[PDB]
Write a protein that binds this ligand. Structure first.
Ligand code: QHE
Length: 127
């Protein structure tokens, strides 16, 4: 069995910014979700080999996880906040697409997404 390469976290030719919205997405949004008791399945790419999910990457063609997002934020990968917000939403959507309602992992995603939405609701105006 085989995992795909992980999502890109480094691309020197991609133009970058460090903005107050992106700083909020690291210091508030990612940090809030990362410390949560349900974060652990989301803190790195899905290891479909060790988890015995051989169809995971047959179904999920845009993988995303908070380990990737953390690296992207810490390494200033993004131009704008929307790119990072999209990564979070991709991560939640993947979980809901792959799994069944009420599965433990879906409940975990829902708890993280509730906090994501609460924090994103107060994304600061760009300075
Ligand atoms: C985002 C994780 C995930 N998404 N779909 C499934 S079925 C099982 C898991 C899982 C549970 C614990 C640890 C690692 C993976 N997942």
């Amino acid at each position: 069995s085989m995992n795909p390469p992980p999502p890109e976290t480094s691309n020197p030719n991609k133009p970058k910014r460090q903005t107050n919205q992106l700083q909020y997405l690291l210091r508030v949004v990612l940090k809030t979700l990362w410390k949560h008791q349900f974060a652990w399945p989301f803190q790195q790419p899905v290891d479909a080999v060790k988890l015995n999910l051989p169809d995971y990457y047959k179904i999920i063609k845009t993988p995303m996880d908070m380990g990737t997002i953390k690296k992207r934020l810490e390494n200033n990968y993004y131009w704008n906040a929307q790119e990072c917000i999209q990564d979070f939403n991709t991560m939640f959507t993947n979980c809901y697409i792959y799994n069944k309602p009420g599965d433990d992992i879906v409940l975990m995603a829902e708890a993280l997404e509730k906090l994501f939405l609460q924090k994103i609701n107060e994304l600061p105006t760009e300075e």
